[PDB]
Amino acid sequence: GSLTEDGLSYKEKFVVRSYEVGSNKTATVETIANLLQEVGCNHAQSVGFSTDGFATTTTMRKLHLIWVTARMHIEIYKYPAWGDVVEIETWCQSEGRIGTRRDWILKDSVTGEVTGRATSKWVMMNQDTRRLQKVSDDVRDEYLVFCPQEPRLAFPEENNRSLKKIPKLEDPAQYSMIGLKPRRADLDMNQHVNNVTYIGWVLESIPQEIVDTHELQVITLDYRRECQQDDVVDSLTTTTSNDSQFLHLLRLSGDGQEINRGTTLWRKK
Amino acid sequence: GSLTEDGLSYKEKFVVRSYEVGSNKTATVETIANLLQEVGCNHAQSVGFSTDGFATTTTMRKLHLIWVTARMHIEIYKYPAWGDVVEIETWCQSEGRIGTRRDWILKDSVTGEVTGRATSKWVMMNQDTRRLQKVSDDVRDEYLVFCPQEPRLAFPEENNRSLKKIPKLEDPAQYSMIGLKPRRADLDMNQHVNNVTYIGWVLESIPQEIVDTHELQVITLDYRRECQQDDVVDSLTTTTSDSQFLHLLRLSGDGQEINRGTTLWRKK
C-alpha cells in the first residue's frame, strides 16, 4: 500500500485467500472488516503513528487519551471471490470537537467498479478512567494535517443508513447463541478483543436458513463496552422486517450488561 | 507466487499483517498455519486444480471426495515480525501407495535464512457420508507428474520428531479449557471446521504463564475425527517435561477423541 499523490488518503490491494472465503467462495464480511482494519493500520503507520492505541498523538499520550470506535457501518454490493484483487482506499476526517470519522471505498481492481463502502465514528477517552470527552484544539491541530479539510464522505446521502439510531432489543429475543467466549486468536497485539470478533458474534444468532439463502448487504454496529478476555457473551437477534432486517444485541452472560447493539439487512440470493 | 525452475515446487512471499501478530508483534502459529494452507492452495492452482474446488482433483470432484489432514508437524525457529516478508516453498510427494505428503520450508526473504519447516500427511473423505479413505491410485495419478520422484523431505533425519508416535492423555488432565464451539468464521469453503481451529483449540489449554514467558518451537497434531458445526470440544493438557506438553481434544458430550498432539516450548 501507499499514500495517494496528495498524501491525504491511503490505498492498498489484497488478493483474497483460500481461508478468507465462505460457502460461495467469496470473502466473508469478517474478512472485509479485517482488511478495513489493516488498511487503516497501514495508513496510520505511513504518517508516523505508533501502536499504543489507534493513532495516538503526542499531546494525547501526554494526557493519557486514546481513540475508541463508537460505531462501524459497512455496505457491500459484491463480495470479492477467492483469488480476486480488491483495492481499498481510506481516509480520516475531523468532525470538530465531537471526534473523527474514518471512511473506506472498496473496488474491483480489474474493472474499477465500487464493490462496497464503510464508515466508522471515533471518540476520545481517558485511557485510565474510561470517560469520554470533546477533542481539544491542541489535539485536533496535531492530526488535521493528515485529513482532507473539505467534506469527503463515503455516505453523502441526506438520511442514510450509516447515521440511523439503533434501539435496544426487548426480552425475549426471537433467536439466540449463548456462551460465546474469545480465544487467543481473537485478541489484537495489545491483548484487547478485536472489533471484528463482535461482528462474528452478532452474526452467530442469525438463523442458518437466512445465511444459506440470503447475502448480507448492510451491517451497523454500536460499541458500548469492550468484552474482556475472561468474559462470556450472549448474542440475541429479532427480525424487524426479498429483504430481511434484524435487530441485534450482545450482552455479558453473567450480569446482562450491554457490550454491543446493531442491525443487519439481507437480500435473497 | 510462482512455480520454481524445475516446476516441482512453488514459492510465495507474504507481508505479515497487523492482526496476524501476537503480543511480541510477531506472527502467531495460527497465522503460520494459515499461510501454509494458502501457499499449498496456490501451488494446487498453479498446476491445474481450479478454484471450483478446495485443491481437489478432477476424479475427486467426480466422486464427491475432499481432502482431509491426517497429521501436521510444524517447527518454527524465528516467527516473522509485523511487516516482514516471509518466503514459503511447498511441494507434494507420494510415499509409495501408503502416504501422501505436503512439506514446506519458511525463509527470511531478505537473508535467505531458514526460519521454519513443516510437514503434513493426507487422507480423503466422501463429502456426503463423511467416511475417510486413503488416497486412491486414480487420484494419485492426477498429480504424480507434479511431484519430485526422489525423496525430498523437509525433515530428513531417521527417527525425527515429525514421525514420533503420540500417546493418549490419561485422566485427570493437569490443565483444561472446556466448552469450545466453532463459529462461522471457523469453517472452510466446504463448511467443515478449518485446520487452524484445531491448532487454536489445542493451545487454549496451555497456561497463560507459559505463553507469556515461552515461545512455541514444535507442534505435532494427529487428526482422528472431524469436529462438526454443532459439536462442543474440551481441550486437555498435561506437562511431560524447555517445557513439553501432551494434548488431547475430545467431544464434551461422549468424550470421543478428535485430536491428540504434543508441543515443545523454549523460555524466551
Ligand SMILES: CC(C)c1nc([C@@H]2CCCN2)no1
Ligand atoms: C492516519 C491519520 C489520517 C489519522 N487518522 C486518525 C483517526 C483516529 C481515529 C480514526 N482515524 N487520526 O489520524
